[PDB]
Design a protein around this ligand. Structure first.
Ligand SMILES: [Mg+2]
Ligand SMILES: [Mg+2]
Ligand SMILES: [Mg+2]
Ligand SMILES: [Mg+2]
Ligand SMILES: [Mg+2]
Ligand SMILES: [Mg+2]
Ligand SMILES: [Mg+2]
Ligand SMILES: [Mg+2]
Ligand SMILES: [Mg+2]
Ligand SMILES: [Mg+2]
Ligand SMILES: [Mg+2]
Lengths: 60, 130, 140, 236
RNA sequence: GCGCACGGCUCAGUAACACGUGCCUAACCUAACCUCGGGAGGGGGACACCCCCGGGAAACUGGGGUCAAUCCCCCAUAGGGGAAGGGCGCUGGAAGGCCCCUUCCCCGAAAGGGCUGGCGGCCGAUCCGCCGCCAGUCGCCCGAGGGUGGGGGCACGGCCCAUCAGGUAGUUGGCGGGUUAAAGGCCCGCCAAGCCGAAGACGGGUAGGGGCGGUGAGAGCCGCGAGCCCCGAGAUGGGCACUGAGACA
């Protein structure tokens, strides 16, 4: 599970950097399938601080 | 400020010289005072804004370098520089320690001026040339 | 001296709790708050990629007192606290006398707070991608 | 802030002993505490529409009560001299007027004079722009240009339009007008102004009023001019 | 955010501007509220709850991550303060005040935020919002006045003892300053010898002051002047500060 989470956290942080530069759709692209991936493994709550930050970045 | 160390309440002495008791045990904060804040002659101007009674504000000059000297004979205002404090008639110990008070003489760039504001209360040195 | 290290990963938001002992224990004593020690010291406890230096962020003593960065040296002290670091005021302007400890570590500290400092430009995976209790609860 | 029942004003229409130890305290509105009555007292005592304080607050909380064209939803709002109180769902209007018995009374008035309020000039101040500000007997203000405000001296009564924020009519204080005493023992009396002993302080001048031929005297501070032989608006 | 400085208790200190009556602040501050006039533009940040870990007996408390504001901060303009010269004008009994003009120095606002309805646009059921406008309503900032609360000042009134007769030396006043929201030996630098007293100083004793209460036919005497109301002071003794409109709570 640490393997799946490390890339997930890596993919969550990378989209965060994209959202700061104005690329909302591609960042929304990353946030989407990470949401697909964490839902069926029960890792949504584990990444709760990061999903909260990402949507705040896109909502700007 | 309102500090009990600088209490401005009444004396405990009658005009006859006799002593009287204390009607109130504590020192009221409304009757409190504060330490002096008159500026000292320094290489740059430093101003401090202080919150006072009623949520008001008072401008304090912690360190004074320029004076708004005004020439009566010419009707012009100059923001001249200050070189030394010539003499303080209220107390020489202000001039002896380079502390500017109202009525003090200052040897400014334009000449001499008499300080015409209360630099601990106004926060600026308004001066009139002699 | 036995320790309960709190190693937190900024890039994953998780913390791993290591218990330092004899060989590394003197590597921590004498260090001030904010210090830089290379992550290879914890190689036998944790794997850290070679761009990370774990940073010293604070800790607590044997009696629960926290270490104060604004107090220097390894000493116990009483302060008239008025702010967050070592005090949580309940009313505005309220100042309280609180017991704290210096930022320089010593034998009486039981909790030591350290955080990983990833290298510049690093974008690899998280050194602590999950919590131990969280992972154990997740598996259960 | 509390108000003990003992410390309540003497003229209030409430029992002095029987009741609680407390009275409703007006919330620093457009009058004086000694000369104002809170809105909850009027709704419960003077109009008797509410039997308790909660019922009075409920009535006020719905905005049913209008005071001088503005709906007051504060149950501690002060009401005083020459104020126009309007009850929206019933359509009744009153003007709190100086009374010979109750000292202050709710008198019904026609709907036409409901927007009008007679205000006594308490003083003027010079404000920025060179304009003049007028202060009235209930603390209300009105800024005017300097020339128009020059001719309105203190104690002059002006009939003020609450609807237009304007001055309908200016009533100077001269000998020979109709005045109503608004404070003191001789309250409620309306008579002709025919005598004055001008003291050093003008506010303390001795003034006499006549009504053929009952003559009452007060100080100049305690009389409002309501016009010539016909009062401009219904007060009695 | 607002309130908790109101409310409740008690009677040690106090013979005093404490209290009462009658006046002042032209020497002052005031959140909430009322009225009139004006304003709401640009840009940033952090910290809780929470999550991953704790430390500690407990009190309490540490590190990393992370979402906001009517939270905090900056920029602009309005405005504000000081010094100086002029004026028709205002208030007021009387201008060291207000207003207008000129010069300089200095400080320096705001939450267009919430709700409701209407319109339109962006966006998406992993969103359930964001944006522009309009109206209604509740709010925010500035100037002036009121209101309320408070700081200060004055005249007079109310105990006993001479087996207490001289007391006072910042003591009394002047000038110049500091501090204060504001006058003042309130404090400080200098100058003088004044200030109080037998119309009783000083010292001692007792006591919270008043509305009032008991008694007597009354004058009067007494305080049961405990309980209720108003003012004062205090929170184990003595001091000193934070926040705040307001406390030295
Ligand atoms: Mg009380
Ligand atoms: Mg933090
Ligand atoms: Mg605010
Ligand atoms: Mg002004
Ligand atoms: Mg600014
Ligand atoms: Mg904002
Ligand atoms: Mg002075
Ligand atoms: Mg003295
Ligand atoms: Mg009792
Ligand atoms: Mg004590
Ligand atoms: Mg205490």
């Amino acid at each position: 599970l640490e393997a799946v989470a490390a890339k997930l956290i890596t993919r969550l942080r990378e989209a965060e950097r994209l959202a700061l530069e104005g690329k909302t759709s591609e960042a929304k692209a990353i946030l989407k399938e990470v949401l697909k991936e964490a839902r069926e493994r029960g890792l949504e709550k584990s990444l709760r601080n990061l999903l909260l930050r990402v949507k705040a970045l896109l909502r700007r | 400020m309102k500090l009990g160390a600088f209490y401005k309440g009444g004396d405990l002495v009658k005009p006859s010289g006799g002593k009287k008791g204390r009607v109130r045990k504590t020192k009221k904060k409304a009757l409190g005072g504060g330490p002096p804040q008159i500026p000292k002659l320094g290489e740059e101007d430093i101003r401090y804004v202080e919150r006072v009674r009623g949520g008001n504000h008072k401008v304090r000059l912690r360190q004074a370098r320029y004076a708004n000297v005004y020439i009566p004979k010419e009707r012009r205002h100059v923001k001249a520089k200050i070189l030394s404090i010539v003499s303080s008639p209220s107390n020489p110990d202000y001039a002896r320690r380079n502390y500017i008070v109202k009525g003090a003489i200052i040897q400014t760039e334009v000449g001499k001026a008499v300080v015409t504001s209360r630099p601990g209360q106004d926060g600026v040195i308004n001066a009139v040339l002699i | 001296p036995t320790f309960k290290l709190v190693l937190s990963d900024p890039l994953s938001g998780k913390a791993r709790q290591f218990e330092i002992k004899d060989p590394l224990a003197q590597r921590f004593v004498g260090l001030r708050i904010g210090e830089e020690i290379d992550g290879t010291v914890l190689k036998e406890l944790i794997e850290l990629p070679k761009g990370v230096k774990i940073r010293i962020t604070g800790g607590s003593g044997v009696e629960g007192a926290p270490m104060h960065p604004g107090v220097p040296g390894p000493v116990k002290r009483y302060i008239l606290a008025d702010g967050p670091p070592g005090y949580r005021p309940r009313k505005r302007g309220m100042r309280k006398k609180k017991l704290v400890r210096g930022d320089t570590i010593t034998d009486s500290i039981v909790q030591i707070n350290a955080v990983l400092v990833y290298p510049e430009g690093y974008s690899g995976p998280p050194a602590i991608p999950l919590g131990a209790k969280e992972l154990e609860k997740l598996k259960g | 802030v509390h108000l003990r029942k003992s410390l309540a004003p003497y003229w209030w229409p409430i029992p002095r002993k029987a009741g609680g130890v407390w009275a409703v305290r007006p919330s620093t509105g457009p009058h004086s505490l000694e000369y104002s009555l809170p809105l909850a007292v009027v709704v419960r005592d003077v109009l008797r529409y509410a039997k308790t304080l909660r019922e009075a607050r409920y009535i006020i909380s719905r905005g049913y009560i209008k005071v001088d064209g503005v709906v007051r939803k504060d149950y501690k709002f002060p009401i005083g001299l020459m104020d126009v109180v309007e009850i929206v769902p019933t359509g009744e209007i009153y003007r709190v007027v100086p009374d010979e018995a109750k000292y202050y009374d709710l008198k019904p008035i026609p709907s036409s004079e409901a927007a009008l309020k007679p205000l006594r000039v308490e003083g003027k101040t010079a404000v920025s722009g060179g304009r003049i500000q007028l202060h009235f007997h209930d603390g209300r203000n009105l800024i005017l240009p300097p020339d128009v405000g020059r001719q309105i001296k203190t104690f002059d009564t002006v009939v003020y339009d609450l609807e237009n924020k304007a001055i309908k009519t200016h009533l100077p204080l001269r000998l020979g007008q109709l005045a109503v005493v608004t404070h003191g023992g001789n309250i409620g009396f309306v008579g002709q102004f025919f005598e004055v002993v001008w003291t050093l302080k003008r506010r303390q001048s001795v003034v006499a009023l006549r009504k053929g031929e009952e003559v009452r005297r007060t100080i100049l501070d305690y009389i409002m001019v309501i016009g010539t032989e016909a009062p401009v608006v219904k007060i009695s």
